[PDB]
Amino acid sequence: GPSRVRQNFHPDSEAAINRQINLELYASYVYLSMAYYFSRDDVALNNFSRYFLHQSREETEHAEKLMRLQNQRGGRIRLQDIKKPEQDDWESGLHAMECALLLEKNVNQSLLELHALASDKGDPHLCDFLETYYLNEQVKSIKELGDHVHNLVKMGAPDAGLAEYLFDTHTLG
Amino acid sequence: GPSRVRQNFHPDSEAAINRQINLELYASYVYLSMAYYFSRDDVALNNFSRYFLHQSREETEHAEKLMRLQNQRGGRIRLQDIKKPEQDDWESGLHAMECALLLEKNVNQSLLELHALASDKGDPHLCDFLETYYLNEQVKSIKELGDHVHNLVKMGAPDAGLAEYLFDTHTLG
Amino acid sequence: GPSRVRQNFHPDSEAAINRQINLELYASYVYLSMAYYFSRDDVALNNFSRYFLHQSREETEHAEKLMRLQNQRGGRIRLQDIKKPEQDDWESGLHAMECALLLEKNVNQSLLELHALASDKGDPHLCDFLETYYLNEQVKSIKELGDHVHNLVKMGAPDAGLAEYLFDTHTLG
Amino acid sequence: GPSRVRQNFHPDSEAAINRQINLELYASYVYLSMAYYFSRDDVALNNFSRYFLHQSREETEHAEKLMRLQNQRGGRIRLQDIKKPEQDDWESGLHAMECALLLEKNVNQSLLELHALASDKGDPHLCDFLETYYLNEQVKSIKELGDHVHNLVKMGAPDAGLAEYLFDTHTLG
Amino acid sequence: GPSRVRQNFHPDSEAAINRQINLELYASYVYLSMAYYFSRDDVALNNFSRYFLHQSREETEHAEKLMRLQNQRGGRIRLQDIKKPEQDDWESGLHAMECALLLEKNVNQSLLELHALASDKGDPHLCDFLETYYLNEQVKSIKELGDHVHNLVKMGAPDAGLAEYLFDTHTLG
Amino acid sequence: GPSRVRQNFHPDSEAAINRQINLELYASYVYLSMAYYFSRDDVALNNFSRYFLHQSREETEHAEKLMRLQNQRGGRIRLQDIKKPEQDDWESGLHAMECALLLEKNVNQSLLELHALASDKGDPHLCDFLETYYLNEQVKSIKELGDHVHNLVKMGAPDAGLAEYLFDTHTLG
Ligand SMILES: [Cl-]
Ligand SMILES: [Fe+2]
Ligand SMILES: [Fe+2]
Ligand SMILES: [Fe+2]
Ligand SMILES: [Fe+2]
Ligand SMILES: [Fe+2]
Ligand SMILES: [Fe+2]
Ligand SMILES: [Fe+2]
Ligand SMILES: [Fe+2]
Ligand SMILES: [Fe+2]
Ligand SMILES: [Fe+2]
Ligand SMILES: [Fe+2]
Ligand SMILES: [Fe+2]
Ligand SMILES: [Fe+2]
Ligand SMILES: [Fe+2]
Ligand SMILES: [Fe+2]
Ligand SMILES: [Fe+2]
Ligand SMILES: [Fe+2]
Ligand SMILES: [Fe+2]
Ligand SMILES: [Fe+2]
Ligand SMILES: [Fe+2]
Ligand SMILES: [Fe+2]
Ligand SMILES: [Fe+2]
Ligand SMILES: [Fe+2]
Ligand SMILES: [Fe+2]
Ligand SMILES: [Fe+2]
Ligand SMILES: [Fe+2]
Ligand SMILES: [Fe+2]
Ligand SMILES: [Fe+2]
Ligand SMILES: [Fe+2]
Ligand SMILES: [Fe+2]
Ligand SMILES: [Fe+2]
Ligand SMILES: [Fe+2]
Ligand SMILES: [Fe+2]
Ligand SMILES: [Fe+2]
Ligand SMILES: [Fe+2]
Ligand SMILES: [Fe+2]
Ligand SMILES: [Fe+2]
Ligand SMILES: [Fe+2]
Ligand SMILES: [Fe+2]
Ligand SMILES: [Fe+2]
Ligand SMILES: [Fe+2]
C-alpha cells in the first residue's frame, strides 16, 4: 500500500475495473443459462446450445483478462456475488438472441464509460487495453447478434415451425 | 445344480433376467419393423430407416449381454417366443418416434424393477451390472427420442409436407 | 394399393416371402440359443459358441435381404411371432451340429418351394434372387455341417472325452 | 409438465440437484479468487495460481455435468446467485490449501446427502451418476489437498522463507 | 487422529479393509505356490505355471489397490502375517484348478460381506469402489475357473494321460 | 524321490534355500509396508513411496529365482508364513532408510551363510548361483542405502523441515 508496481493508476479506475469484472462474470452466467435452455428435451436446438456455451466461455476469458490487468497494475481484485440471470426459460431461439444483443449493448456501454473514466484520469495504458481487447470485440459481437436476430425475424421465428430448426442447422451449424 | 460357479444368485433374479432378455429381443424386433417401414416406396425416409436399424442392433447387443450375465453367474437361459410388434404400418416418422419413446420408457421401468429386485436380494454384482450398462444408456435413449419428437412436432409433422423430409436429411443424416 | 412400383408380383409370392422372413428369423434365434449354450460354465466350448453366433448373424442378414426384396417389389412386410427354439439345452457339440443340419435342410426345402412358386407365377426376378443369394449358400451350409457331423462322429463325440474339445480347438478355431 | 422424458425422478431430487449446481459454481468462484491471489505482485507464486485456476475449471465441469443430468432426466434447471468467496486475500499458500480442503469436504458432505436422498427415493440412475463421476473424484481431491497441507506444514509454511517458494517450484511445478 | 482427510469412514470399514488386504495377499501366495508346483521336473506343465503366476500378480494388484484406498480415505493400514498355502504339492492340474475356484469363491464371499458392511455404514464411495474394481472381476474369475474345471473333468483329468498335457498346450497356451 | 534331475544337491542346501525364499518374501513385505507408509496423507513423500515399492518388487524377483533354482536342482519348495513387518508406522524417511539398510545387511549375512554351506557341501553350481545373482546385488543395495542415510543425516532429517522433502524430489525423483 501502495503496491511496489503501482503507477499512474487511479483508485477510481481500480474500482471501475472491479465492477467490469463482475459484469463480465454475469454475462458468462447468462450465456450458460441460455446454453442449457437449448438442450432441454422440449427445445432441443443443439447448435443454439453450443453457440451460447461458446459465448459463456468467451465472457469468462474477458473477466480473467481484467483480473490479470488488476494484478499487473497493482490494484486489488474485489469480487462480488454473481447475480442469477433474469430468466430460466428463454422462450425461443429468437428471444434468447434478442436478450443477448441487449446484454452485449449494455456491456458495451459499461466499457465505453470505463474508457471515458480512463481518459479523464490520463491513463493511456488502460485506454489502450480497452481498445485493444474489448471495444473491437464488442462491436463484432453486437453485429453478429444483430445479423442473427434479423435472419430469425425474417424466417418467421418463433412461430414458423421450420425457422429456428433450419437456422440451428444452417447458420449455427 | 447348482452350477459350480453359482454364488449369491437368487432364483428370482435368474427368472427376472430371463424376462428382460425377452423384452430386449422384443425391442430389437420392433425397431427392425420400424426400419423396414421407412424404406417402403411410399414412405422413403432412408435416414429414419438407418436410425431404427441401428437401434435394432443395439437392442440385440443388450439382450446378448444379459445372456452372457446369465452364463457368468451360473443361471440357465430360458428363451420364449419373441412377439411380433404391435403395428406393421408405423404411420409416420413422428408416430414411430413416439412409439419408440414409449417402448424405451417401458423397458426402463422393467430395468428399474430388476434393480429393485437385485437390491432386495442383496446382489450388488447384479445392481452394478444394471447401473453400468443399462440404466445410463436408457436415460440417454429416452432423452434423444424426446428431443426428436419435440423437433418433429414443432416442425409440423406429420402433415407439413417438408417436416419429416427435412428432419430425415438434417438431423438423422 | 397397388404400390406404384409393383409389377409382375403375385400376392401368393408376397405371402410366401413373408413366411420365409419368419423362418430365417427363427433360424437366427435357434443359432443364438446354441451359441449361448456353448458358453455355459458346464459346457465351455468357446469356438462352438463363436461358430453358432456367426451363423445367427448370417440368418439375420438372410431375413433382412428378403425384407428389402419385399419393399423393392412393392409388397408389404407382415411380421409374425418368432417361436422359441425346440431346446434350451442342446446336449453336446455333435447334437447341436445335427440339429443345425436338420434346420438348414428344412430351410432349404422352404426355399425350393418358394422357387417353384416363383416359377409357377412366371416371376424370373424372384427366381434369380433365390438362386443368386439363397440356394447356393444353403448348399454350402448343409455341406459344411455334414462335414462337421462326420468328423465329430468319427472322433467319438459326444462320449469320447477329447473329441469335442479337440474339434473346438482345431476345426472351429 | 411432466416432461415427456421424465421417469422415476422425484421433485426433491430435482431440487437437490439445483442446490448442488449452485455449490459447484460457488466452488469454481472460490478457486478463481485463489488463482488470482497468487499472481499478485506481492505473492507471485505462479504455480499455486495455475493449480487453483485448474481446480476452478474442473468445478465448472462438475456444475455443467449436473446441468446436463437435469436436462437428461427432464428436470428444470433453476439458477441462483453465486455468492462471492469468503476472502479476497487468502493470506498464504498454506492458508489457501487449508481453505480448499475444507471446501472440498463441505462439497463432499453435500454429495453424500444427495446420494442418501437418491437412495431414499429409489433412484439408482442418480445414485450411479454420483458414484461414477463425483464421489471418487472428491476423495482423490481431498487426499491431494491433505498431502499438500502436510508438506507445507512440515516445510514450515507460511513463515519459513523458502517453504512456499520451494513447494511452488517442485510440487506444483 | 482423525486424519485431516477422513470423512464418512467408519472404523469397522477400516478394519474390514485391513482384513481384505490380508486375504488378497494370501491369495497371491497360494497362486505363487501353484505356479512353482507346475514347473517341477515331475509335473512340467509350463502353461499351467504361467497361468497361476499371472493370477498371483493380479492378486497383488488387488491388495495394493485396497492399500491405496485405505490411504485415500485416511485409514491406517495394519498388516498381518501372510499364512502359507494349505498344500505344497497341488497333486494335478485339475486339483489346482478346483482349489483356485474354491479360493475365488471364498474371496468373493468376503467381498460381498465387505459390501454389506459398507452399505450398512452408508459409505457409497466404498460400495462403488468394490463394485467397480472387485465384484465384476471376481465373477469373471470364478466363471473362467469353472470353464477350466469342466473341460479338464470332461477330458478325463487327472488320470487320462493326454488330458492335462493337451489342455496346457491348447487352452492355457 | 530322488527327483530324476537331482545331482550333487545336499538336503541341507535344499533346506537352506527354502529358508532364504522365506526371507526374501519377508523383505518384499517390509518394503511394501514402507511404500504405503510414504503415501499416507500425513507423510506424502511420493518418491520415497515409489522407491520402496520398486525395492519390494525386486525382492519378489529374488524369491522367485530361488524357487526356480529349487525346481531346476530337483529340490522341493516348502513355503512358510510370511511374518508381518516389525512396524506399521515407519516414523520418517530417514528411519525407513536405516531400517532398510539393517534389513539388507541381515539378508546379506544369510546369503553368506548359504554360500559357506554350499562350499562346505562342494556344490559349485549353488556357489556360482549366489555369486552371480545375489552377492553382487546385495553389496550394491547396501551401498546405495548407506549413501541415502548419509545424505539424509547431513541434511538434518528428520527434524529439519526441508530435508526429506528436498531429498524426495532431488535424489529419489
Ligand atoms: Cl492336438
Ligand atoms: Fe463471440
Ligand atoms: Fe477467446
Ligand atoms: Fe471465439
Ligand atoms: Fe464480455
Ligand atoms: Fe436477486
Ligand atoms: Fe460479450
Ligand atoms: Fe487513444
Ligand atoms: Fe441408441
Ligand atoms: Fe452398442
Ligand atoms: Fe451406437
Ligand atoms: Fe435395450
Ligand atoms: Fe399374438
Ligand atoms: Fe432401448
Ligand atoms: Fe449402489
Ligand atoms: Fe457403479
Ligand atoms: Fe439444408
Ligand atoms: Fe455360414
Ligand atoms: Fe454374410
Ligand atoms: Fe460369413
Ligand atoms: Fe438362412
Ligand atoms: Fe410355443
Ligand atoms: Fe441357414
Ligand atoms: Fe442366375
Ligand atoms: Fe482437481
Ligand atoms: Fe476434468
Ligand atoms: Fe484435471
Ligand atoms: Fe466439484
Ligand atoms: Fe453477501
Ligand atoms: Fe472440488
Ligand atoms: Fe485373472
Ligand atoms: Fe491387472
Ligand atoms: Fe490380467
Ligand atoms: Fe483378488
Ligand atoms: Fe500355520
Ligand atoms: Fe482372485
Ligand atoms: Fe534395488
Ligand atoms: Fe530386477
Ligand atoms: Fe531395478
Ligand atoms: Fe533380496
Ligand atoms: Fe507375530
Ligand atoms: Fe534386498
In 10 A of CB A116, how many CB atoms?
Answer: 12
Ligand 15 centroid to D26 CA: how many Å?
28
Integer angstrom CA distances of residue A167 from A145, A160, C63: 13, 12, 41
Q: Is residue E163 part of a domain?
A: yes
Instruction: Let me know the angle formed at the C-alpha of A23 by A22 and A27, rounded to the nearest 5 degrees.
Output: 120
Q: Tell whether residue A138 is among the known ligand binding residues.
A: yes
Report CB contact under 8 Å: B142, D71.
no
Give me the helix-helix angle, D11-38 and A46-73, nearest 10°: 30
Length of chain D: 173
Which chain D residues have a beta carbon less than 8 Å from that of A85? 79
Ligand 8 centroid to A115 CA: how many Å?
10
Element (H, E) at C153: helix C136-155
Per the CB < 8 A criterion, the answer to whether A9 and A61 are in contact is no
Element (H, E) at C55: helix C46-73
> What is the 3-state secondary structure of F95-137?
HHHHHHHHHHHHHHHHHHHHHHHHHHCCCHHHHHHHHHHHHHH
Distance in angstroms (rounded) separating the CA atoms of residues F144 and E47: 38
Please name the member of A40, A76, A81 whose beta carbon is closest to the beta carbon of D83. A81
Q: What is the CA radius of gyration of chain D?
A: 18
Residue F27 CA, distance from chain mean position = 5
Per the CB < 8 A criterion, the answer to whether A96 and A37 are in contact is yes
Instruction: Write down the residue that cell numbers 423430409 correspond to.
Output: B165
Q: Measured between CA atoms, how close is B144 to chain E, in angstroms?
A: 27
Distance in angstroms (rounded) separating the CA atoms of residues C84 and B18: 13
Which chain F residues have a beta carbon less than 8 Å from that of E71? 36, 39-41
Query: For residue C151, what is the DSSP state?
Result: H
Element (H, E) at D79: none
CB-based burial label for B122 (10 Å; 0-12, 13-18, 19+): middle
Report CB contact under 8 Å: D5, B130.
no
Q: Which of D17, D26, D30 is nearest to D78 (CA)?
A: D17
CB-based burial label for F70 (10 Å; 0-12, 13-18, 19+): buried
Give the structural domain span for B116. 11-171
| Most B CBs within 10 Å, among A164, A165, A168, to test the B interface | A165
Q: Cβ contacts of residue B23 below 8 Å, gap of 6+?
A: B107, B110
Q: Which of C74, C64, C149, C151 is nearest to C104 (CA)?
A: C149
Report CB contact under 8 Å: F44, D150.
yes
Which DSSP string do the residues of chain E spell out, in sequence order? ---TT--S--HHHHHHHHHHHHHHHHHHHHHHHHHHHHTSTTT--HHHHHHHHHHHHHHHHHHHHHHHHHHHHT-------BPPPS-S---SHHHHHHHHHHHHHHHHHHHHHHHHHHHHTT-HHHHHHHIIIIIHHHHHHHHHHHHHHHHHHHHTTTTSTTHHHHHHHHT--
Q: C-alpha cell of A107? A: 456491456
Which chain A residues have a beta carbon less than 8 Å from that of B143? 41
Instruction: Write down the residue that cell numbers 489502450 correspond to.
Output: A128
Which chain C residues have a beta carbon less than 8 Å from that of E170? 165-166, 169
CB-based burial label for E6 (10 Å; 0-12, 13-18, 19+): middle
Q: Is D82 helix (H, G, I), strand (E, B) or coil?
A: strand
Ligand 16 centroid to E141 CA: how many Å?
19
Q: Which of D126, A156, E163 is nearest to C161 (CA)?
A: E163
Q: Is residue F5 part of a domain?
A: no
| Most E CBs within 10 Å, among B7, B115, B126, B130, to test the E interface | B7
Q: Is B15 helix (H, G, I), strand (E, B) or coil?
A: helix
Per the CB < 8 A criterion, the answer to whether A153 and A56 are in contact is no
Length of chain F: 173
In 10 A of CB C106, how many CB atoms?
Answer: 13
Beta bridge partners of F82: E82
Which DSSP string do the residues of A102-117 spell out, in sequence order? HHHHHHHHHHHHHHHH
Q: Is B93 helix (H, G, I), strand (E, B) or coil?
A: helix
Query: For residue D83, what is the DSSP state?
Result: P
Please name the member of D39, D64, D82 whose beta carbon is closest to the beta carbon of A71. D39
Say which experimental method was used.
Answer: X-ray
**Number of helical H runs and strand E runs in chain D:** 6, 0
Q: Is residue D6 part of a domain?
A: no
Per the CB < 8 A criterion, the answer to whether E13 and E126 are in contact is yes
Q: Is F82 helix (H, G, I), strand (E, B) or coil?
A: strand
Q: Is residue E144 part of a domain?
A: yes
CB-based burial label for D47 (10 Å; 0-12, 13-18, 19+): middle
Evaluated on CA atoms B112, B134, B22, B6, the torsion sign reads negative
Integer angstrom CA distances of residue E128 from B120, E22, E69: 18, 21, 12
CB-based burial label for B23 (10 Å; 0-12, 13-18, 19+): buried
Q: Which of F105, F115, F104, F135 is nearest to F28 (CA)?
A: F104
- Report how many domains make up chain F: 1
Distance in angstroms (rounded) separating the CA atoms of residues E105 and E157: 22
Q: Which residue of B has its CA nearest to C73?
A: B41
Q: Cβ contacts of residue F115 below 8 Å, gap of 6+?
A: F127, F130, F131, F135
Which chain B residues have a beta carbon less than 8 Å from that of D5? 142-143, 146
Q: C-alpha cell of D154? A: 512440515
Distance in angstroms (rounded) separating the CA atoms of residues B2 and A154: 72
- What values do phi and psi take at C135, rounded to 5? -70, -40
Distance in angstroms (rounded) separating the CA atoms of residues F150 and F127: 33
Report CB contact under 8 Å: E155, C169.
no
CB-based burial label for C154 (10 Å; 0-12, 13-18, 19+): exposed
Give me the helix-helix angle, E136-155 and C163-170, nearest 10°: 120
Q: C-alpha cell of D51? A: 493449480
Q: Measured between CA atoms, how close is B160 to chain A, in angstroms?
A: 9
Per the CB < 8 A criterion, the answer to whether A37 and A89 are in contact is yes
Question: CB-hemisphere CA count at 13 Å for C121?
Answer: 19
Query: For residue C99, what is the DSSP state?
Result: H
Instruction: Let me know the angle formed at the C-alpha of D155 by D154 and D157, rounded to the nearest 5 degrees.
Output: 100
Q: Is residue D68 part of a domain?
A: yes
CB-based burial label for C131 (10 Å; 0-12, 13-18, 19+): middle
Q: Is A151 helix (H, G, I), strand (E, B) or coil?
A: helix
CB-based burial label for C120 (10 Å; 0-12, 13-18, 19+): exposed
Distance in angstroms (rounded) separating the CA atoms of residues F153 and F143: 15
Distance in angstroms (rounded) separating the CA atoms of residues C12 and E126: 64
Please name the member of E5, E74, E125 whose beta carbon is closest to the beta carbon of D135. E125
Ligand 1 centroid to C140 CA: how many Å?
27
Q: Measured between CA atoms, how close is D19 to chain E, in angstroms?
A: 20
Chain F positions contacting chain D at CB under 8 Å are 41-44, 161-162, 164-166, 169
User: Looking at chain E, which subunits does it touch, using at least 3 CB pairs closer than 8 Å as the criterion?
Assistant: B, C, D, F
Which segments of B39-120 does DSSP mark as H helices, in order? Answer: 46-73, 93-120
Q: Which of E100, E126, E114, E115 is nearest to E28 (CA)?
A: E100
Give me the helix-helix angle, A11-38 and A93-120, nearest 10°: 170
Instruction: Write down the residue that cell numbers 404400418 correspond to.
Output: B89
Q: C-alpha cell of B139? A: 436415460
Evaluated on CA atoms F139, F144, F146, F147, the torsion sign reads positive
Integer angstrom CA distances of residue D58 from A50, D10, D29, D84: 19, 28, 11, 18
Q: Tell whether residue C131 is among the known ligand binding residues.
A: no
Which chain E residues have a beta carbon less than 8 Å from that of B71? 143
Distance in angstroms (rounded) separating the CA atoms of residues D13 and D120: 10
Distance in angstroms (rounded) separating the CA atoms of residues F99 and F34: 10
Ligand 1 centroid to C151 CA: how many Å?
15
Q: Cβ contacts of residue A171 below 8 Å, gap of 6+?
A: A148, A151
Q: Is A66 helix (H, G, I), strand (E, B) or coil?
A: helix
Q: Is residue E6 part of a domain?
A: no
D8 sits in the region (left: phi over 0; alpha: psi -120 to 50; else beta) called: left
Ion ligand 23: protein residues whose beta carbon lies under 5 Å = C 104
Cα dihedral A152→A155→A161→A166 (10° resolution)? -70
**Greatest alpha-carbon span in chain D:** 62
Domain of E37, CATH number, reads 1.20.1260.10
Q: Which of C170, C172, C164, C171 is nearest to C44 (CA)?
A: C164
Q: Cβ contacts of residue B48 below 8 Å, gap of 6+?
A: B34, B38, B93, B96, B164, B168, B172
Q: Which of D77, D97, D114, D109 is nearest to D30 (CA)?
A: D97
Integer angstrom CA distances of residue E67 from C26, C108, E78: 52, 62, 10
Ligand 20 centroid to C141 CA: how many Å?
10
Which DSSP string do the residues of D89-144 spell out, in sequence order? ---SHHHHHHHHHHHHHHHHHHHHHHHHHHHHTT-HHHHHHHIIIIIHHHHHHHHH
For chains A and D, CB pairs below 8 A equal 72
Q: Is D31 helix (H, G, I), strand (E, B) or coil?
A: helix
Q: Measured between CA atoms, how close is E154 to chain F, in angstroms?
A: 30
**Number of helical H runs and strand E runs in chain C:** 6, 0
Please name the member of A64, A78, A84 whose beta carbon is closest to the beta carbon of D88. A78
For chain B, first and last CA: distance in Å? 51
Q: C-alpha cell of C71? A: 419393399
Q: Is residue C4 part of a domain?
A: no
Q: Is residue A3 part of a domain?
A: no
Ligand 10 centroid to B138 CA: how many Å?
12
